[PDB]
Symmetry: none
């Protein structure tokens, strides 16, 4: 009898998640039918969107999420035993799939690149950075780009794509270790927004003439400050607003419209899965090539043990992670 472990939402989140909001459960998977495969999670991801999306779950439901898995049992010759796939059964160690909701990893994947990169730099967060910067911000080279949560999965890729396109990049991060990381990736200016005396003065010193593009992952009052330093016709890619995801009171004041209008800002939000097919596969091939060419470096914040997946999720929300947060099954 094939068994699985599953993390469920015991209680809807109030502020930051805590341990008591999750419940680990064990169950037996049904026998494998023809055309189906048994998938064993190798790496699971935790992601900020899970904090926003959990409100649509019912208590008792499995937490949503993607994973890299390997076929351990196969009644499907297209997915033979040993095949590596991306699947989204949620926070579970094993699952059954008929193949229609799976994705194989890029065919040209070298043995030197961790499979877990398919959940990060050469995965959904890397595609978020890719399309957000190149199509929503529309950088053509030479722009000054501000990016926050810059040492995270999305932000670290944003800055490095911007650098290879010829941009100046200013990155905000929450720890001194993250400062060193991004200065090693080539960021032009990197500062710890939690320890600077004034965010406003720090951003002005980093780019006294303002910012052409703002890849916004944080929202809130941080973004109000950046908006006051956007150049005329500046573009904001509204990627996320993680300062608001765990919020317990009211949203903060909005960006002051008189500045937005006088600077004629263009602020567009996007979802990474707007792009599919040709587009998404081509972007993944670019990200992989750039990793193999050394133009995109990566770091992973790997937490060992499926039983520590809630801890990985809460740690990521608190800024513990340098790079993509991953859970090794």
């Amino acid at each position: 009898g094939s068994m699985t472990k599953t993390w469920t939402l015991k209680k809807h989140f109030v502020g930051y998640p805590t341990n008591s909001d999750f419940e680990l459960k064990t169950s037996e998977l049904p026998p494998l039918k023809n055309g189906e495969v048994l998938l064993e999670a190798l790496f699971l991801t935790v992601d900020p969107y899970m904090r926003v999306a959990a409100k649509r779950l019912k208590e008792g439901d499995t937490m949503m999420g993607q994973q890299v898995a390997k076929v351990v049992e196969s009644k499907n010759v297209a997915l033979p035993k040993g095949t590596i796939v991306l699947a989204s059964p949620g926070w579970t160690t094993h699952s059954i799939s008929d193949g229609k909701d799976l994705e194989k990893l890029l065919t040209e994947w070298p043995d030197t690149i961790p499979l877990s990169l398919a959940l990060g730099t050469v995965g959904m967060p890397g595609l978020t950075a890719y399309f957000g910067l190149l199509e929503i911000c529309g950088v053509k080279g030479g722009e000054t780009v501000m990016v926050n949560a810059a040492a995270g999965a999305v932000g670290s890729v944003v800055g490095q794509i911007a650098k290879l396109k010829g941009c100046k990049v200013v990155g905000a991060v929450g720890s001194d270790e993250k400062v060193a990381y991004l200065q090693k990736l080539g960021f032009d200016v990197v500062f710890n927004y939690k320890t600077v005396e004034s965010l406003e003065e720090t951003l002005k010193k980093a780019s006294p003439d303002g910012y052409d593009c703002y890849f916004d992952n944080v929202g809130g009052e941080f973004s109000n400050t950046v908006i006051g330093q956007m150049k005329k016709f500046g573009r904001i890619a509204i990627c996320g607003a993680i300062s608001t995801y765990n919020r317990t009171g009211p949203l903060p004041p909005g960006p002051p419209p008189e500045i937005v209008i006088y600077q004629e800002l263009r602020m567009e939000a996007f979802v990474v899965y707007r792009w599919q097919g040709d587009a998404r596969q081509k972007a993944l091939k670019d990200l992989l090539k750039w990793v193999l060419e050394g133009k995109i470096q990566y770091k992973e914040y790997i937490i060992e043990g499926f039983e520590n997946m809630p801890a990985a999720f809460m740690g990521m929300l608190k800024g513990d992670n340098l790079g993509k947060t991953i859970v090794k099954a």
Copy 2:
């Protein structure tokens, strides 16, 4: 010659009041240049924001249609000029823009300050380039009985769009229903703005021409369709606002709907684009496609009252002061 000028005596706290202004009389020097007599002056919301950058004693800023009274600018010529809130001014001849060569005698000269002027250009580029309507969309427009808003709704209608308009009085509702706006409501008297917008367009809104901002816009944003476009033209609900700025739109909604929100300034468009827009606006006015209405206040001495009344919704159409 003599002149009268309105100056900022005290910086505005909330809405202006009469004591924040001061009328001063002075003696213009003899020409040694042209002398211009104000015929029609305009008051506009931007003056509330721009006055914060003035010093107490400076003349209020503003545009006017004036006539020469004393060779390329002979006596009797009509010109747009922006010497501020004043009845008479001296010009070197370079800061003046002449009305369209084909300005017919069938439309008031004051339209050069409204529908065939800066407000009409704001509605034109805001709707056609920023929102980018092509026909068939559902457009939400607030301050819809004002100078910009009423032109936005009429352009949207001649492009084949459904137009939902919000105004602050029942008289403005009646006027816009005669103009043919698909749905018009008084936002000050509806039981629930959210309910009214849902009934006006159960499908949602493709475009939002935003003149108001604030909490009104947070509600509209909750009913934008996916990939909806918001033209951030103004935020009049914040210009005179005491206290802290209102919350912004919920980011979860902006992101899930993948909204594009772009602000603009009418004077971005210069040269050929500006002139083509003015000639489209004038053609639509002569064809009847854009009806015009002006809120004319008689007397230069009532200019502060016209400005304050406009900020508070007294005006139906472009607020104009006849000197």
Copy 3:
């Protein structure tokens, strides 16, 4: 007999403007038995009118008190020539059956303006008297913070505080008002509009903190004062004029952690709570203190009933030094 009346043409949005008011003329009917005909001598304008006007319907007469003279009388208790306080609103003439009228103190001298019955020896003075002596409960030797301190209420609060043995810190909005309160003997006076830091000015004024806070202003000003209240300090919430003309949400409240740790008492009051013997005794004390020079008065007189809206609006904007009064 004709009368002029100021009516509310449009409800206020932000500060009142001229267009919100409309002057109307009418003819009053003949007197019935028991009634009198009053001619306004002095009318008052007060901050409360900005708050209470929201209760009016457009067309209604603006509310307000006045010192009036009986010019025709079918009321034996109110013969021709009698001076009274009446509240018919902003009107030059009115008819009264007598029951809503108040005679001035029988001991009222001819050496002081009649208009003090609308100020220091009237409703504002009573507001200062009971707000300071009963709500704050000053007992002698305390440090008192009072804002709008050059106004009808504030200037009396500080002077009563002085003659009780208190130190008085006063906040005002102009240097002219600073000079006036320095003449009245305020220990510390400052212009809250020009100081670099309100917090630092209040710390320097009283390093020890404040025992009592007579609050006329509210808003952020009061949040700063509350951060410097001593333990068990008392706040008399008299007004909140910084909010009366507001167009958006109120500013944040006082930080509750400070209110609780300092165990503050914050009590609001309305002057008309006190009646009968208590009210009469207060009026006799105020009059006595004025005749003895212990309470000096200053009036901001505006001539002409036609300028009453302008007097109301100037007062709201802080142009008045002392009680604002309109001479009919």
Copy 4:
């Protein structure tokens, strides 16, 4: 001897999470003469720890009180077996010289849990007692609004109000808490998280308004209650838990025009203001009311010192019905 201690690993942002705390083991120092070794039997978690943690340095022990027993004694006043209240923080074992310890009431009976010395017959119960009987000044027949009414303080407030002859309206965060307080005899109880309109619900609960408001919550909730206070209504500002875990800006303050029109008295207090005979008398009254059944006790017991952070976070989020207690 060894001890386990919970320390603040990281300052809280919003509500705490588990990784903000860190459990450390250490060897206690030897017992000097006059000292005792205390073993925790029951520890409390309280809302004030969220506010007070802001002033700790990372690495510091979390503050808090406990019921402890003397397990080793060099102090003849505190022999082995003695039960004491002590405040060494979140720790299983501690040393004391006896000066900071409080013995239980001489008349404490064996029929009630010792953990009531941390709740109803302890600091939360004294808070309710003095806040209602001295700050609100309940005299019988008033209508009292109390929020967090199913918590340690609030549940005692409502039951004292009932035995003093008052009508009690309580607000709580769950249907189970509504049902429990209805069982105790609260006149009206509602779930503030699920009602369509807080304003409408409060008006239905007491159409004539409220004489007294025991305020544990503050924020927007209190602004709504203040709009329904009767004239001369009294507010006991006990806490403001809606602000303790906030991240953005404080909410608007109460509308001063309503505060002034209704002439409200709003006084904050700290339970430790009352000492000596007054405190001992209140404790004896609370114990008598428990033994008589007029104050039914209810504890939300969490087993295991290792679960103390989760008990604290659960209490802050409304998990607790009654006083939150950790059984060592």
